[PDB]
Design an enzyme around this catalytic site. Structure first.
Site, short mmCIF file in Angstrom:
data_model
loop_
_atom_site.label_atom_id
_atom_site.label_comp_id
_atom_site.label_asym_id
_atom_site.label_seq_id
_atom_site.Cartn_x
_atom_site.Cartn_y
_atom_site.Cartn_z
CB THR A 12 9.99 -8.95 -10.12
OG1 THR A 12 9.47 -10.31 -10.36
CG2 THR A 12 8.97 -8.06 -9.40
N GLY A 13 11.45 -10.15 -13.01
CA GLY A 13 12.50 -11.14 -13.44
C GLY A 13 12.62 -12.14 -12.27
CB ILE A 14 14.53 -15.11 -11.32
CG1 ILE A 14 13.83 -15.74 -12.55
CG2 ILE A 14 14.47 -16.08 -10.10
CD1 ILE A 14 14.46 -17.10 -13.03
CG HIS A 15 15.68 -9.90 -9.44
ND1 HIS A 15 15.50 -9.74 -10.78
CD2 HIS A 15 17.03 -9.93 -9.23
CE1 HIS A 15 16.65 -9.81 -11.42
NE2 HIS A 15 17.59 -9.89 -10.49
CB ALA A 16 11.55 -9.47 -5.19
#
Length: 87
Positions: A12-16
């Site tokens: 997700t990478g740095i998200h959600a």
């Protein structure tokens, strides 16, 4: 002041949720905490700043912690990145 480099591996990478939990953790400290990616820096206590950075899977980032509770603040951030499977 403490500075540390990390390589993001979450899909997700740095998200959600991973991004919200990280900002929540940063927000518990008084020190200034910044996240830097490809030369741009944002306040890690700001969800808007973090989302604006657009950090995806495979990214190299640097986190700086500077203040009265910087030792435990950097420690807590390292712990959180590893517990969330972000880096």
């Amino acid at each position: 002041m403490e500075k540390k480099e990390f390589h993001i591996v979450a899909e997700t990478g740095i998200h959600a949720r991973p991004a919200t939990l990280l900002v929540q953790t940063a927000s518990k400290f008084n020190s200034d905490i910044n996240l830097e990616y490809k030369g741009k820096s944002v306040n890690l206590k700001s969800i808007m700043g973090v989302m604006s950075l657009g950090v995806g899977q495979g990214s190299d980032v640097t986190i700086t912690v500077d203040g009265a509770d910087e030792a435990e603040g950097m420690a807590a951030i390292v712990e959180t990145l590893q517990k969330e499977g972000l880096a």
